[PDB]
Amino acid sequence: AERSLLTGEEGWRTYKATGPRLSLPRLVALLKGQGLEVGKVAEAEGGFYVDLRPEARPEVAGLRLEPARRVEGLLE
RNA sequence: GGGC
């Protein structure tokens, strides 16, 4: 009863990540460093969308994270 | 499906 906005797959919640010196590998490193499991990541004009577990409550210093309402500005 |  909870699906990724990037994939369709159940068990994910899509977040928008923004911040300075952002890049895919660094983003993935910061998250996994907090012991979070990381699903699909996709780059957008204003940052990255990243899938996380719905029960996870992610706090990562240096980044702003918020549940994505709409997915927009994907580089594709 | 990815480790500054």
Summarize this entry quickly:
This protein has 76 residues and is an alpha+beta fold. It has one helix at residues 24-33, and strands at residues 13-18, 38-44, 47-52, 64-67.
Based on CA inertia axes, which overall geometry fits?
Answer: globular
Helices, by number, come to 1
β-strand percent reads: 25-35%
> How many whole angstroms does the radius of gyration measure?
11 Å
CATH class: Alpha Beta
Number of distinct beta strands: 4
CATH topology: Alpha-Beta Plaits
Strand arrangement in the largest pleated sheet:
2-3-1-4
User: What oligomerization state is this entry in?
Assistant: monomer
- End-to-end Cα distance, whole Å, is 27 Å
Which structural class best describes the helix and strand composition? Answer: alpha+beta
Count of spatially separate domains? 1
Q: Major beta sheet, specifics?
A: 4 strands, antiparallel
Protein name: Heat resistant RNA dependent ATPase
Family: Belongs to the DEAD box helicase family.
Organism: Thermus thermophilus (strain ATCC BAA-163 / DSM 7039 / HB27)
PDB class: hydrolase/rna
